[PDB]
Amino acid sequence: GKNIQVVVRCRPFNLAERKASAHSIVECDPVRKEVSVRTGSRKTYTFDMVFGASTKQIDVYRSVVCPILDEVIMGYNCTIFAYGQTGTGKTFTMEGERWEEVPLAGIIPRTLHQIFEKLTDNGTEFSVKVSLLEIYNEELFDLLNPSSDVSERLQMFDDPRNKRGVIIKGLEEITVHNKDEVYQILEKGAAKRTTAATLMNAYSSRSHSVFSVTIHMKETTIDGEELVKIGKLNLVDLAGSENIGNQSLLTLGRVITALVERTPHVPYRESKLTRILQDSLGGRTRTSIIATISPASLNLEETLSTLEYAHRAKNILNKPE
Amino acid sequence: KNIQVVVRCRPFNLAERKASAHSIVECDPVRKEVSVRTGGLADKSSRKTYTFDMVFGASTKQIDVYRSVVCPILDEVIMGYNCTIFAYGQTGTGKTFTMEGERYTWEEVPLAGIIPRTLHQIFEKLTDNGTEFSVKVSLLEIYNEELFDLLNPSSDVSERLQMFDDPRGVIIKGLEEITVHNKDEVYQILEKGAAKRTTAATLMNAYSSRSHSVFSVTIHMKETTIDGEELVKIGKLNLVDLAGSEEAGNINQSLLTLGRVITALVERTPHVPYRESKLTRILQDSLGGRTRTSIIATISPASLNLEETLSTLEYAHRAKNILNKPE
Ligand SMILES: Nc1ncnc2c1ncn2[C@@H]1O[C@H](COP(=O)(O)OP(=O)(O)O)[C@@H](O)[C@H]1O
Ligand SMILES: Nc1ncnc2c1ncn2[C@@H]1O[C@H](COP(=O)(O)OP(=O)(O)O)[C@@H](O)[C@H]1O
Ligand SMILES: [Mg+2]
Numbered sequence: 001g002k003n004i005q006v007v008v009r010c011r012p013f014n015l016a017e018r019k020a021s022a023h024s025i026v027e028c029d030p031v032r033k034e035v036s037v038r039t040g041s042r043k044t045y046t047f048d049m050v051f052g053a054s055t056k057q058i059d060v061y062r063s064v065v066c067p068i069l070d071e072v073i074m075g076y077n078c079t080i081f082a083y084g085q086t087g088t089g090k091t092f093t094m095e096g097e098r099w100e101e102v103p104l105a106g107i108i109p110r111t112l113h114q115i116f117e118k119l120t121d122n123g124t125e126f127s128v129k130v131s132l133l134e135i136y137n138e139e140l141f142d143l144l145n146p147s148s149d150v151s152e153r154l155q156m157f158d159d160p161r162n163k164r165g166v167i168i169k170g171l172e173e174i175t176v177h178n179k180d181e182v183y184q185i186l187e188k189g190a191a192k193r194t195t196a197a198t199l200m201n202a203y204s205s206r207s208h209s210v211f212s213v214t215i216h217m218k219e220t221t222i223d224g225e226e227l228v229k230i231g232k233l234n235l236v237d238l239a240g241s242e243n244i245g246n247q248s249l250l251t252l253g254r255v256i257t258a259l260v261e262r263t264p265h266v267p268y269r270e271s272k273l274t275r276i277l278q279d280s281l282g283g284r285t286r287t288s289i290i291a292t293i294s295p296a297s298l299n300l301e302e303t304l305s306t307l308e309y310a311h312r313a314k315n316i317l318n319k320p321e
Numbered sequence: 322k323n324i325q326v327v328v329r330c331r332p333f334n335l336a337e338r339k340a341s342a343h344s345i346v347e348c349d350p351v352r353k354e355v356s357v358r359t360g361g362l363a364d365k366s367s368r369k370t371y372t373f374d375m376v377f378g379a380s381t382k383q384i385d386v387y388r389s390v391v392c393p394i395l396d397e398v399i400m401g402y403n404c405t406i407f408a409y410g411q412t413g414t415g416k417t418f419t420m421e422g423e424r425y426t427w428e429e430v431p432l433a434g435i436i437p438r439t440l441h442q443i444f445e446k447l448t449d450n451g452t453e454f455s456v457k458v459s460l461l462e463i464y465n466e467e468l469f470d471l472l473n474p475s476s477d478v479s480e481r482l483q484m485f486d487d488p489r490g491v492i493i494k495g496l497e498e499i500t501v502h503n504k505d506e507v508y509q510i511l512e513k514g515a516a517k518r519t520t521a522a523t524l525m526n527a528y529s530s531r532s533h534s535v536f537s538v539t540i541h542m543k544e545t546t547i548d549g550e551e552l553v554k555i556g557k558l559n560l561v562d563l564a565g566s567e568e569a570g571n572i573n574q575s576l577l578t579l580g581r582v583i584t585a586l587v588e589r590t591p592h593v594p595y596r597e598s599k600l601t602r603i604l605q606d607s608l609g610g611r612t613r614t615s616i617i618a619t620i621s622p623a624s625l626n627l628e629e630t631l632s633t634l635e636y637a638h639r640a641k642n643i644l645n646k647p648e
């Protein structure tokens with residue numbers, strides 16, 4: 001439990017689902033923190049939080065991200081994952097759509113927005129840098145490198161200074177000079193993802209996208225302390241859930257269950273994704289998974305697998321009704 | 322020949338586009354080939370190709386599928402034969418669109434599917450023709466190997482139907498057969514039906530994507546001519562909307578059996594297993610003789626769906642194996 005929170009966000013019905021007379025098979029209870037699926041009876045699950053279909057972008061940021069970002073600012077490493085079937089709002093949650101953050105903008109812009117705000121406001125001295133890479137078929141593609149050819153992919157090495165840490169050789173890290181750059185950066189990176197799909201067949205719903213902001217901080221108070229700090233926040237938009245049956249999800253899972261159940265050897269090195277994230281992941285870092293689901297019976301089968309998966313990663317006991 | 326296998330590819334849907342899927346399907350009507358790009362990471366040369374009796378691209382209109390697949394079969398039905406057309410494929414790829422369409426007036430609406438078009442043509446031809454005739458229709462769905470009657474006004478309830486063995490025929494006790502007096506009458510019947518189907522889904526959890534759905538139109542004809550060979554005929558046309566190809570081993574088992582039946586019919590090999598599934602037994606009547614049977618395999622253009630599209634083409638190729646040809 002503790003460091004690791006797991007929450008389910010359910011999206012609204014889409015046009016397709018309506019048009020097909022699809023039935024809402026999912027009950028979301030925010031307050032009892034329970035999801036239920038009608039299979040007729042019902043299977044009920046419990047999570048640290050549950051977000052019904054009416055929840056706005058800000059509600060998510062506020063109850064999920066804020067605690068974590070406080071911790072990153074404190075100079076730690078965190079990860080927020082979005083897991084679930086394609087079309088259930090992973091990206092929507094993680095990025096969003098087009099001064100204050102447009103109500104449709106998701107976690108990544110808000111995160112960037114907030115970072116500047118707080119550090120400017122407390123007069124901390126800091127520099128922000130972001131990087132974006134996707135993992136397709138256990139192979140790393142840098143989405144921010146303006147130069148490289150599409151077939152170019154990055155290799156990682158062990159970090160001599162850090163037993164948990166890793167070195168991605170060649171990875172572009174762009175410097176961010178204000179809260180608005182994020183967008184055009186997210187745009188560079190979308191141009192490239194496209195390209196990799198057209199030319200390499202690495203389709204975005206079939207791969208993991210890892211967006212990583214690293215904050216260098218120096219805080220100073222006369223008669224106080226001089227703190228030197230580096231926080232880092234990896235915001236991970238996972239490959240579509242339906243690809244199980246691909247195996248990086250199973251490992252990601254095996255690693256979260258281990259972390260939560262506290263078993264002797266957490267298998268980080270058995271997948272690229274968890275290898276890379278191994279530096280968040282574990283001691284005293286908030287880690288969070290947002291599982292996305294559809295309400296409709298059209299998608300029932302996948303909705304279930306997602307919830308089995310969330311359930312398996314952090315197994316909470318159903319409280320008496 | 323008698324068994325026709327055809328393929329219909331739909332346009333992209335909203336999901337696929339929100340998902341950034343790319344077109345992997347290429348349909349060639351003249352060559353009657355369909356080819357799908359199978360490339361994994363950095364593979365652009367890997368393409369799989371299949372030939373069928375006809376191929377429809379994403380832009381093929383309702384009426385054009387009708388003119389091509391149906392008319393020939395209907396002629397056969399109208400001579401007093403028992404015939405079946407199937408729709409097979411992954412959920413969301415247009416099985417129901419193809420069989421039903423989307424709904425008033427005399428010239429069929431452009432989104433009308435095979436069902437209201439078929440009823441159209443029957444009245445239009447028999448009327449014009451001076452045939453003394455009647456048309457009844459039944460609509461049942463088969464879920465979990467259990468029969469349900471979607472046309473019965475009463476029995477709004479679970480209530481399955483019991484199937485006996487008629488002394489290649491078979492009897493379903495209690496099946497509503499509605500008599501149709503006018504062509505335009507066919508729409509309310511498809512709504513009565515759609516309605517029940519949906520109740521069944523909400524109350525019994527039989528979602529239409531899990532069910533085989535069977536719409537049976539039986540025609541009775543007496544055709545007379547002076548110095549003309551007075552004639553009596555019964556036509557029957559089974560339009561079957563299959564469950565999505567993607568207790569589940571029950572759905573799989575039946576679709577597999579269908580395929581065994583379809584192949585047995587082509588190789589002419591004796592012992593086609595009409596009896597392995599409730600679906601094939603219910604239909605044994607119209608698969609039995611040498612009579613036009615035809616299958617429409619529906620598919621998605623999108624990369625997101627590639628595995629299922631392949632499965633579907635694999636299925637259709639197994640049903641009737643027609644070699645890829647040169648040039
Ligand atoms: N919680 C939500 N509220 C409103 N719209 C949503 C929500 N989740 C998803 N959508 C919409 O559903 C569609 C699929 O979203 P997307 O994030 O692309 O799914 P994924 O990235 O998981 O494949 C998009 O049109 C998105 O705007
Ligand atoms: N060939 C097609 N042309 C135009 N629209 C189509 C086609 N096939 C399917 N659609 C649309 O796609 C959606 C799903 O079709 P549907 O027939 O319900 O698929 P299935 O019945 O095989 O699950 C419907 O909105 C339908 O109108
Ligand atoms: Mg997406």
Ligand SMILES: [Mg+2]
Pocket residue numbers: 416417529530562
């Ligand atoms: Mg259907």
